[PDB]
Amino acid sequence: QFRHDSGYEV
Amino acid sequence: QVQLKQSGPGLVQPSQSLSITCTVSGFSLTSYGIHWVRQSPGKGLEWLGVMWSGGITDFYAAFISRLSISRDISKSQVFFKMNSLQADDTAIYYCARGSRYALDYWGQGTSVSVSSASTKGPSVFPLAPSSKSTSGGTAALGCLVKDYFPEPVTVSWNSGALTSGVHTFPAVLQSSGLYSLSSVVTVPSSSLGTQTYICNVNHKPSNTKVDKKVEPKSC
Amino acid sequence: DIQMTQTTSSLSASLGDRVTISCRASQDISNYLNWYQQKPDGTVKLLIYYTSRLHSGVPSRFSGSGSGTDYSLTISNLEQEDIATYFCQQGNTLPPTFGGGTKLEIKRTVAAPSVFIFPPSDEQLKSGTASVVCLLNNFYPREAKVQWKVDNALQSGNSQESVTEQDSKDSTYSLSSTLTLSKADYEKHKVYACEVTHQGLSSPVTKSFNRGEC
Numbered sequence A: 001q002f003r004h005d006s007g008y009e010v
Numbered sequence B: 001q002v003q004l005k006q007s008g009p010g011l012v013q014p015s016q017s018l019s020i021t022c023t024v025s026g027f028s029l030t031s032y033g034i035h036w037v038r039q040s041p042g043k044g045l046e047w048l049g050v051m052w053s054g055g056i057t058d059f060y061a062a063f064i065s066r067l068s069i070s071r072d073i074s075k076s077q078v079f080f081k082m083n084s085l086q087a088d089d090t091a092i093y094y095c096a097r098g099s100r101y102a103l104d105y106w107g108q109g110t111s112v113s114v115s116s117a118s119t120k121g122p123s124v125f126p127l128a129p130s131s132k133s134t135s136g137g138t139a140a141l142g143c144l145v146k147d148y149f150p151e152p153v154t155v156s157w158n159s160g161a162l163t164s165g166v167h168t169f170p171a172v173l174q175s176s177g178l179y180s181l182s183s184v185v186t187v188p189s190s191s192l193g194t195q196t197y198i199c200n201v202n203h204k205p206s207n208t209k210v211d212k213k214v215e216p217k218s219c
Numbered sequence C: 001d002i003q004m005t006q007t008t009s010s011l012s013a014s015l016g017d018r019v020t021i022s023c024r025a026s027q028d029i030s031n032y033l034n035w036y037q038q039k040p041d042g043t044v045k046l047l048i049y050y051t052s053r054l055h056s057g058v059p060s061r062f063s064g065s066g067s068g069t070d071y072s073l074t075i076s077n078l079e080q081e082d083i084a085t086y087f088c089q090q091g092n093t094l095p096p097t098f099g100g101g102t103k104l105e106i107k108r109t110v111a112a113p114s115v116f117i118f119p120p121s122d123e124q125l126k127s128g129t130a131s132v133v134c135l136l137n138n139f140y141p142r143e144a145k146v147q148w149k150v151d152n153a154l155q156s157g158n159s160q161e162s163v164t165e166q167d168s169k170d171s172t173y174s175l176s177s178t179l180t181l182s183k184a185d186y187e188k189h190k191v192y193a194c195e196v197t198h199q200g201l202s203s204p205v206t207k208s209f210n211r212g213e214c
Helices: C123-128
Strands: B001-008 B018-025 B033-039 B045-051 B057-059 B067-072 B077-082 B091-096 B103-106 B111-113 B123-127 B138-148 B155-157 B164-167 B181-188 B198-203 B208-213 C009-013 C017-027 C033-037 C044-049 C061-069 C070-076 C085-090 C101-105 C114-118 C128-138 C145-150 C158-162 C173-182 C191-197 C205-209
Touching: B001 B091, B001 B103, B018 B033, B018 B091, B033 C128, B045 B067, B067 C061, B067 C173, B077 B091, B077 C009, B103 C044, B123 B198, B123 B208, B123 C123, B123 C191, B138 B198, B138 C114, B138 C191, B155 B181, B181 C158, B181 C173, C009 C017, C009 C205, C017 C033, C017 C085, C017 C123, C033 C061, C044 C061, C070 C085, C114 C191, C128 C145, C128 C191
Parallel strands: C009 C101
Antiparallel strands: B001 B018, B018 B077, B033 B045, B033 B091, B045 B057, B067 B077, B091 B103, B091 B111, B123 B138, B138 B181, B155 B198, B164 B181, B198 B208, C017 C070, C033 C044, C033 C085, C061 C070, C085 C101, C114 C128, C128 C173, C145 C191, C158 C173, C191 C205
């Protein structure tokens, strides 16, 4: 997943 | 209550830029991403880029040299700009809030047409009911609304008194950049030549109003 | 990119039906799959996120299932307000990618078109051109074929079609075909005809006028 808010990607 | 409100143009000349502002309320830009997506006719949704919550952007590969996205946190605004639009950039453009998993709240969309056409009111012509209309049956008549720009036009019948059985077709964009449509109505054959039928065409962009009487013909 | 495919572009169903819309990813997306609804007026809402989670305010008649590469959205009992276009989106790997969309329409019984042909107006002819219009009125299903014939022979590359959105009251469509010629060309033929093929017609319907009678 990527966070759709911060763009943080696992 | 979460709201995203878009402002920006309906018409961009080819090789000119598109600018859209997304003004948000009910949340902070510092907590959520603002994504930019478009929908073209006969294409799906296409992701263009985003302003992440932390203030950095990401652009889709096909737009890396044409896009600018910035924000003003104090004003709750995100600014989108795309350089040098061409025909294949005609689309509805959206901003959308990104939360943890998805684009959870969307702007209303900005319908962007790319065209060099000049503003032009329509030519309005009658579509006469057939002389072979079935006796005691149903007849069709209409008006052809030809070669106008830009959208939209509205069409009424008998000053809006007649609405049953009306079909005003979606416009077709011609190679010339002009639009055309017809509006038709089915009526009792028995009413032909006793009831007057007039189409009332309004093209607000050109400040054009035409009223056209539709009379029976002999073929 | 992860390519998203919605193999069906259009689905027909009746109000009350269970409706399932499929989505496939080109690789495993570990359940990070979202669904969006775009209404005819262009407004978009999130319905479902993370395969199965309902977004705030969304009716529980929407549900979602899947894993790996294959996902679906189900509407348990279809309502009028659900007539819209549905898109999936993977949330697994940047960049975000969407399926091509699946548009719903209302299924109803067959209705053959009522066919009408219109000659050019004298006004238009004075200006130097001639549009001939063929109308197919109030039919179902949406697919139809219209062929232009002049003096009982064919034509290509010179007409345009428009189709209405499905009627809210009777679930039918209507279609126009417009053939535009120069006045000179119009005056070379006697009989103009529109020939219509449709699932409700056992054989094609032709409507015609005689230019010389108008």
